[PDB]
Specification:
mainly alpha, 3-stranded antiparallel sheet, 17 helices, 1% strand, endoplasmic reticulum, palmitate, phosphatidylcholine transfer activity, osmolarity-sensing monoatomic cation channel activity, phospholipid scramblase activity
């Protein structure tokens, strides 16, 4: 190629931007047609959404308003200082028809402006924390004080005789009189049978209606996944409805009866104990171990662990998935299967953004096409990144959590973390390694050049698979979000709540990409800010005019706060990584970035034990 390594002209941004703009307008046209069939911006309101849809929605929109303010400050600062700074360097022998001029790759190793880059990263962390401190600390509802009157204990499974438990608690202090000490059972099996039974009665009701309307016996398929199999199947004879449900309901009824009779057995020692005067209940909790052990009735004392469970309530008939005690294996197997699917979903993105760049036996620069290697790969990646939340929620449901608040929180975090691995982590790591082995092959194929020119090593196109990604996200994702597709295309087979966890995770994946690649690719911040403004408008409209108000758990917004604090940490980590991969580990800039990261991680993990009054209020 006779000069430093080249790629697309301009990074292939204008073509994908124009085509996404055209497709975004097309999707707006289609949505307008469908809306006119049913019944700039059509309207915007403030106090109506303030009052109608509830404090939860107001809180969420306040979150995204604060993050748009954060990205405006970010964008001005970056595109004002860093972009001229990065463009001032002259490592890339200037062509000016290339993306790499704006990036961090256009900066010679040993230059002191890397200090400016890392200083900006640190200030970015500080300013994000400050902005969302101003958010969460000005409109924050307090903690609950209602149900703190009972304990959830992994107690004795021998027989869990309740009055002996009350006698023990009398020994401790008799003030907290125990109205009942109810141990749970294999309600899993019992109301699995009972839920199949209830399905049977609803089915019998609809069958009563069906053969009261038609008044004719029906030739119906009971075989699952036999919705429209009118052909003869081996051993799949279709029985008349009446004889079907009558025998099924009778069998399930007697099975449920005997099942409950043996549910009298099956201790599963997890008994609840109702208390009084929550303060003394707090004393009782303080009485128990917080793992404050060093080592070296008058019976077992170490096995009880205290907690406050009640999802509906702390009474009998508690819950269903309270089965697995040591079956983490379910959780890890589900995570591993999803992770393998995740690799197989990320791989096409890379091996479609880099087919032409594989150094062919005659590597001339006229083997490219910006459209095919930019717009299609990021469109594929965005399609997968809009399909992931559904899969993650499905898998989380099949993990069998046993606290619905816990399930929602952990599902939100899993959705965000898997989006991070599939959008930011794996593509960036893969592209960095891929370009390392590109430079190796190039500098080896050139005759006997032993020294590997680490100065000009970075992502192929110096990082433009993400500007295209964020642009495609913004346009062809807000168009779809306004179209209600992210749930309709999957559960089309009547109005619904919209899950907060999914929106938080998706908005956080995009914001994490944008804030991770501010310093090392300044041109990206305006595109992310445009994305987030359009997301704000579309969320406001969709939330107000087409969805249902409800009452979500408080701890979710704490999760959003934690995630926002997390993203600039990733920014620091990848600035460290690229400094290491460019200019060696021992270099002073890499040292100072590394020590900043270590200070940040130690102070972040210092909050769980000590209260340092500086971290942003969250989990």
């Amino acid at each position: 190629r006779s000069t430093v390594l080249q790629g697309l002209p301009f990074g292939g941004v204008p073509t994908v931007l124009a085509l996404d703009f055209m497709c975004f307008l097309a999707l707006l046209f289609l949505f307008s047609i469908l809306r006119k069939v049913a019944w700039a911006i059509f309207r915007i309101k403030d106090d109506e959404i303030r009052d109608k849809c509830g404090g939860d929605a107001v809180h969420y929109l306040s979150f995204q308003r604060h993050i748009i303010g954060l990205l405006v400050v970010v964008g001005v600062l970056s595109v004002g200082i860093v972009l001229p700074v990065n463009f001032s360097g002259d490592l890339l022998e200037n062509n000016a028809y290339s993306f790499g001029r704006t990036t961090i790759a256009n900066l010679k190793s040993g230059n002191n402006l890397l200090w400016l880059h890392t200083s900006f990263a640190f200030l970015y962390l500080l300013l994000t924390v400050y902005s969302m401190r101003r958010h969460t600390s000005k409109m924050r509802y307090k903690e609950d004080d209602l149900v703190k009157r009972t304990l959830f204990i992994n107690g004795i499974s021998k027989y869990a005789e309740s009055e002996k438990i009350k006698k023990h608690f009398e020994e401790a202090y008799p003030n907290c009189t125990v109205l009942e000490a109810r141990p749970c059972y294999n309600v899993a099996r019992l109301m699995f049978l009972d839920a199949e039974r209830k399905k049977a009665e609803r089915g019998k009701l609809y069958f009563t209606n069906l053969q009261s309307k038609e008044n004719v016996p029906t030739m119906i398929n009971p075989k699952p996944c036999g919705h429209l199999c009118c052909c003869v199947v081996r051993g799949c004879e279709q029985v008349e409805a009446i004889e079907y449900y009558t025998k099924l309901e009778q069998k399930l009824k007697e099975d449920y009866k005997r099942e409950k009779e043996k549910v009298n057995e099956k201790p599963l020692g997890m008994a609840f104990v109702t208390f009084h005067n929550e303060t003394i209940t707090a004393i009782i909790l303080k009485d128990f171990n917080v793992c404050k052990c060093q080592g070296c009735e008058s019976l077992h004392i170490s096995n009880w662990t205290v907690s406050y469970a009640p999802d509906p309530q702390n009474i009998y008939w508690e819950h269903l998935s309270i089965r697995g005690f040591i079956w983490w294996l379910r959780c890890l197997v589900i995570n591993v299967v999803l992770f393998i699917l995740l690799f197989f979903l990320t791989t096409p993105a890379i091996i479609i953004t880099t087919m032409d760049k594989f150094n062919v036996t005659k590597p001339v620069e006229y083997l490219n096409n910006p459209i095919i290697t930019q717009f299609f790969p990021t469109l594929l990646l965005w399609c997968f990144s809009a399909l992931l939340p559904t899969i993650v929620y499905y898998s989380a449901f099949f993990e069998a959590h046993w606290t619905r608040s816990g399930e929602n929180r952990t599902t939100m975090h899993k959705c965000y973390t898997f989006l991070i691995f599939m959008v930011l982590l794996l593509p960036s790591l893969g592209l960095s390694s891929l370009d390392l082995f590109f430079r190796w092959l190039f500098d080896k194929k050139f005759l006997a050049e032993a020294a590997i020119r680490f100065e000009c090593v970075f992502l192929p196109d110096n990082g433009a698979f993400f500007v295209n990604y964020v642009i495609a996200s913004a346009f062809i994702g807000n168009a779809m979000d306004l179209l209600r597709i992210p749930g309709l295309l999957m559960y089309m087979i009547q109005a619904y709540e919209f899950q907060f966890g999914a929106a938080y995770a998706w908005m956080m994946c995009v914001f994490t990409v944008v804030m991770t690649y501010s310093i090392t690719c300044p041109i990206i911040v305006p595109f992310g800010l445009m994305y987030m403004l359009l997301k704000h408008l579309v969320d406001r409209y969709n939330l107000y005019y087409a969805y249902l108000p409800a009452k979500l758990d408080k701890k979710i917004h704490s999760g959003a706060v934690n995630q926002v604090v997390a993203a600039p940490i990733l920014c620091l980590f990848w600035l460290l990584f690229f400094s290491t991969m460019r200019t060696g580990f021992l270099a002073p800039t890499s040292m100072f970035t590394f020590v900043v990261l270590v200070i940040t991680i130690v102070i972040c993990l210092c909050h769980v034990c000590f209260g340092h009054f500086k971290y942003l209020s969250a989990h």
